[PDB]
């Protein structure tokens, strides 16, 4: 269909650009002006530039004029957008989409419907590291409580994400994956997955299987009581 293949999720420390192939498909080019829009996670969206496909009219947005360069590749209808002197503000999922060209022969669109799927770019100076999981998965008998919960402490990993499963994904009840809240310390985001077992489960160990594939690290854990 009228589709966009974005490629690909990539981070840079403060360095050079993350020029994204925005591969168009299904619809004809040189009639449909393609934009770019950034959105930081948990934030609103920011349109940041839109070329006309042929006779490339740049229309870069405010605060980056400048740092952005957008190019066209109408041999095979991909488009591109760079950034210059990258910076920690550029922790945003970059979406390309199509305004529609505001020429004379181009058909009427205003509404961005090829939609691109998104591209993870966080600008980041951290190094690729596995998590340092500091769990507690006790035998639900801390002091006296019946449905005593447990959870691991997925700490100090980079980049995203970790993949955590309780006992190779056996314990799915009570699973509440805390998102990657990002450390201001070393840009090593923090997550945790917890479950709520009962006190009549004390002869059961629970292994969060924390598997951080961008560092190719795999973590299995358990914690018991203290006599």
């Amino acid at each position: 269909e009228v589709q966009l293949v974005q490629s690909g999720a990539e981070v840079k420390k403060p360095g050079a650009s993350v020029k994204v192939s925005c591969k168009a498909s299904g619809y004809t080019f040189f009639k449909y002006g393609i934009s770019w829009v950034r959105q930081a996670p948990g934030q609103g969206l920011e349109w940041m530039g839109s070329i006309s496909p042929y006779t490339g009219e740049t229309h870069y947005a405010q605060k980056l004029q400048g740092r952005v360069t957008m190019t066209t590749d109408t041999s095979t209808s991909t488009a591109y957008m760079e950034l210059r002197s990258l910076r920690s503000d550029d922790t945003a999922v970059y979406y390309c989409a199509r305004e529609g060209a505001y020429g004379y022969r181009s058909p009427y669109q205003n509404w961005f419907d090829p939609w691109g799927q998104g591209t993870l770019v966080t600008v980041s100076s951290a190094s690729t590291k596995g998590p340092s999981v500091f769990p507690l998965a006790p035998c639900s008998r801390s002091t006296s409580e019946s449905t005593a919960a447990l959870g691991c402490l997925v700490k100090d990993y980079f980049p995203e994400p970790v993949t955590v499963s309780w006992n190779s994904g056996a314990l799915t009840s009570g699973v509440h994956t805390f998102p990657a809240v990002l450390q201001s310390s070393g840009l090593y985001s923090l997550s945790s997955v917890v479950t709520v077992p009962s006190s009549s489960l004390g002869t059961k160990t629970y292994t969060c299987n924390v598997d951080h594939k961008p560092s190719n690290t795999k973590v299995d854990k358990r914690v018991e009581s203290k006599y």
Partner: protein, 214 residues
């Protein structure tokens, strides 16, 4: 740079009747803006393309009005798969401002967090650090507090919180403030209490332990 102000900041509605939403413009856009369906962790999807007219496979219930300052988005027949952050966005003025964000939640009732503080591991004491994790779990809404107490000392800044999404199953939430300390400041104290104040809680619930207890 026409500011787009969405009049519902968030919304919570147990699935039912008309859940109409609103966005206002700083100028007269005059039916030249669109509605969007940024689902969590997903690419946004076009809902309405020009203030109405129900873009290209939208099912049955997503009309809207406007023309030309304050625009509406009618979620008439709620259909709880549609719980997503919604967006007005002007187009026919540059630069092309988006809206604010229209996180649509579910309104079950206000529940109490099952609060569970957790000591740092001795493996973390082998790392020379300490992170105390205080749960909140299975509650509603997100409007909560955590007041860390380090031999009953109201501390913050050493604590990063973590908000689950609203569950599809029980519509709940789960929090964890993570009182990340040094090992040295950890060894200075024992009574590690976590004063949690939530609406489902009748009291500010202070979940505590002692350094070396559990």
């Amino acid at each position: 740079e026409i500011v787009m102000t969405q009049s519902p900041a968030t919304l919570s509605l147990s699935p039912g009747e008309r859940a109409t939403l609103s966005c206002r413009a700083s100028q007269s856009v005059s039916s030249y803006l669109a509605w969007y369906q940024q689902k969590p962790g997903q690419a946004p999807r076009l809902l309405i393309y020009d203030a109405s007219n129900r873009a290209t496979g939208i099912p049955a219930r997503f009309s809207g009005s406007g023309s030309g300052t304050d625009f509406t988005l009618t979620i008439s027949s709620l259909e709880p798969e549609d719980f997503a952050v919604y967006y007005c966005q002007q187009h026919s003025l540059l630069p092309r401002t988006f809206g604010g964000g229209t996180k649509v939640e579910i309104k079950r009732t206000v529940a109490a967090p099952s609060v569970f503080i957790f000591p740092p591991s001795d493996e973390q004491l082998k790392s020379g650090t300490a992170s105390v994790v205080c749960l909140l779990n299975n509650f509603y809404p997100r409007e909560a507090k955590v007041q860390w107490k380090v031999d009953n000392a109201l501390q913050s800044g050493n604590s990063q919180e973590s908000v689950t999404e609203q569950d599809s199953k029980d519509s709940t939430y789960s929090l964890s403030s993570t009182l990340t300390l040094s090992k040295a400041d950890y060894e200075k104290h024992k009574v590690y209490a976590c004063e949690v104040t939530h609406q489902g809680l009748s009291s500010p619930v202070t979940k505590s332990f002692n350094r070396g207890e559990c």
